[PDB]
Design an enzyme around this catalytic site. Sequence first.
Site, PDB file in Angstrom:
ATOM      1  CB  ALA A   1       1.091  -5.367   4.460  1.00  0.00           C
TER       2      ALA A   1
ATOM      3  CD  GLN B   1      -7.959  -5.964  -0.768  1.00  0.00           C
ATOM      4  OE1 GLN B   1      -7.496  -5.513  -1.704  1.00  0.00           O
ATOM      5  NE2 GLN B   1      -7.147  -5.918   0.325  1.00  0.00           N
TER       6      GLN B   1
ATOM      7  CG  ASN C   1      -6.280  -1.899  -1.854  1.00  0.00           C
ATOM      8  OD1 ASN C   1      -5.747  -0.826  -1.234  1.00  0.00           O
ATOM      9  ND2 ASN C   1      -6.040  -3.131  -1.532  1.00  0.00           N
TER      10      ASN C   1
ATOM     11  CE1 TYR D   1      -5.494   0.978   2.463  1.00  0.00           C
ATOM     12  CE2 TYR D   1      -4.922   3.006   3.327  1.00  0.00           C
ATOM     13  CZ  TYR D   1      -4.705   1.771   2.682  1.00  0.00           C
ATOM     14  OH  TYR D   1      -3.717   1.851   1.879  1.00  0.00           O
TER      15      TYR D   1
ATOM     16  CB  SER E   1      -0.918  -0.078   1.158  1.00  0.00           C
ATOM     17  OG  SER E   1      -1.977  -0.790   1.071  1.00  0.00           O
TER      18      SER E   1
HETATM   19  C1  LIG Z   1      -1.813  -2.065   1.615  1.00  0.00           C
HETATM   20  O1  LIG Z   1      -0.834  -2.441   1.778  1.00  0.00           O
HETATM   21  N1  LIG Z   1      -2.981  -3.049   1.526  1.00  0.00           N
HETATM   22  C2  LIG Z   1      -4.323  -2.137   1.578  1.00  0.00           C
HETATM   23  C3  LIG Z   1      -4.544  -2.019   3.329  1.00  0.00           C
HETATM   24  N2  LIG Z   1      -3.629  -1.217   3.681  1.00  0.00           N
HETATM   25  O2  LIG Z   1      -3.622  -1.289   5.286  1.00  0.00           O
HETATM   26  S1  LIG Z   1      -1.872  -0.855   5.411  1.00  0.00           S
HETATM   27  O3  LIG Z   1      -1.075  -1.624   4.762  1.00  0.00           O
HETATM   28  O4  LIG Z   1      -2.000  -1.228   6.998  1.00  0.00           O
HETATM   29  O5  LIG Z   1      -1.673   0.696   5.172  1.00  0.00           O
HETATM   30  C4  LIG Z   1      -4.676  -3.520   3.911  1.00  0.00           C
HETATM   31  C5  LIG Z   1      -4.377  -4.441   2.894  1.00  0.00           C
HETATM   32  C6  LIG Z   1      -3.066  -4.193   2.105  1.00  0.00           C
HETATM   33  C7  LIG Z   1      -3.452  -4.771   0.577  1.00  0.00           C
HETATM   34  O6  LIG Z   1      -4.207  -4.645   0.082  1.00  0.00           O
HETATM   35  N3  LIG Z   1      -2.020  -5.452  -0.029  1.00  0.00           N
HETATM   36  O7  LIG Z   1      -1.816  -6.083  -1.359  1.00  0.00           O
HETATM   37  C8  LIG Z   1      -2.178  -7.489  -1.049  1.00  0.00           C
HETATM   38  C9  LIG Z   1      -3.323  -7.629  -2.320  1.00  0.00           C
HETATM   39  N4  LIG Z   1      -4.606  -7.188  -2.110  1.00  0.00           N
END
Ligand SMILES: *C(=O)N1C[C@H](NOS(=O)(=O)O)CC[C@H]1C(=O)NOCCN
EC number: 3.5.2.6
Length: 358
Positions: free
Chosen positions: A315, A117, A149, A147, A61
């Site tokens: 992540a 998602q 995506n 939050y 992210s």
């Molecule tokens: C970003 O890494 N994301 C979106 C969401 N962000 O929370 S954070 O990392 O704490 O800022 C959590 C899940 C994560 C994902 O979506 N990573 O991509 C993996 C495939 N969907």
Amino acid sequence: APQQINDIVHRTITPLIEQQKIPGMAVAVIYQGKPYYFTWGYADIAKKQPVTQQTLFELGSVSKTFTGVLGGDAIARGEIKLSDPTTKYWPELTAKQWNGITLLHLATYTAGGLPLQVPDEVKSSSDLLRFYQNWQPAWAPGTQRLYANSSIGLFGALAVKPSGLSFEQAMQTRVFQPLKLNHTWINVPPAEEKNYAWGYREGKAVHVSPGALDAEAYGVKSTIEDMARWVQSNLKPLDINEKTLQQGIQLAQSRYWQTGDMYQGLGWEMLDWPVNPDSIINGSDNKIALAARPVKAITPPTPAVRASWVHKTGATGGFGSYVAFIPEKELGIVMLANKNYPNPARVDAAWQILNALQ
Ligand SMILES: *C(=O)N1C[C@H](NOS(=O)(=O)O)CC[C@H]1C(=O)NOCCN
Ligand SMILES: [Cl-]
Ligand SMILES: [Zn+2]
Ligand SMILES: [Zn+2]
């Protein structure tokens, strides 16, 4: 590096790695504007390939900070306005719930409950239109931050439409190349795969899977050196010679919404410096960061405040990343690891280091 940096990094990161069972890690500490690099462990455990300053990690992210800056660059070019309706760029989104949802709402997670998602079954452009056409908001636009995506991902895809370039081409031409991020990739080329670390989840080597709007929301890979240069660029936008990109960096650090002590930028999130460390640490837990929370608009958005803690977590299944910086102090940190370990541990370690060096 200065002894004070070496000491705090060893005493903070080596135990973090011990505590969290991280196989490989790269850290850049930016102190008085200059990066100092540190690596530990393995990019590929079975091959015994060490992490180096050239190792590519999945940013997850943290990718959204690139998306936000590219969007800011488009604003500075006059190609988009944040007040523009989504339907200006996607007129096939005819469902009535989209009336009143602007690019601002998409960029800042405030459209009214777009989901975290994009569903994994969305494989085609037809599937994507159906997804957004059938989505029903839980809240009126501009009232709650959730939050998502699927929110900033759509923002990035639409923000580049006036350019006539794909999202990837726009990012490469307008952000990566001018900033000399020559080892930062949406799609890792074959000749660079040798540098691509494996992520580790439950002991198994994994890479992120393709998904709709992945480049915009979680799909960038980069090295510790390029990420340090990204931090330097966000710390010192006036050093960027391309005026639209200088301005896009600044616009991504403008404050568009407030909830509690945090402010939403474009990709970046910000708090006033000095920060309450417990607020950034506790606020990074998924249970909090991903919950719906009411927002107050800031109109006009506050221009980028130098005395801020500016940051983003990221992540994937096999990776965990964190970037934080303080423009007024010319101080920052990048932490890239090939295990997804809890956000609060990342933020705590980052604040121990930066607090020691302020
Ligand atoms: C970003 O890494 N994301 C979106 C969401 N962000 O929370 S954070 O990392 O704490 O800022 C959590 C899940 C994560 C994902 O979506 N990573 O991509 C993996 C495939 N969907
Ligand atoms: Cl020690
Ligand atoms: Zn020790
Ligand atoms: Zn190279």
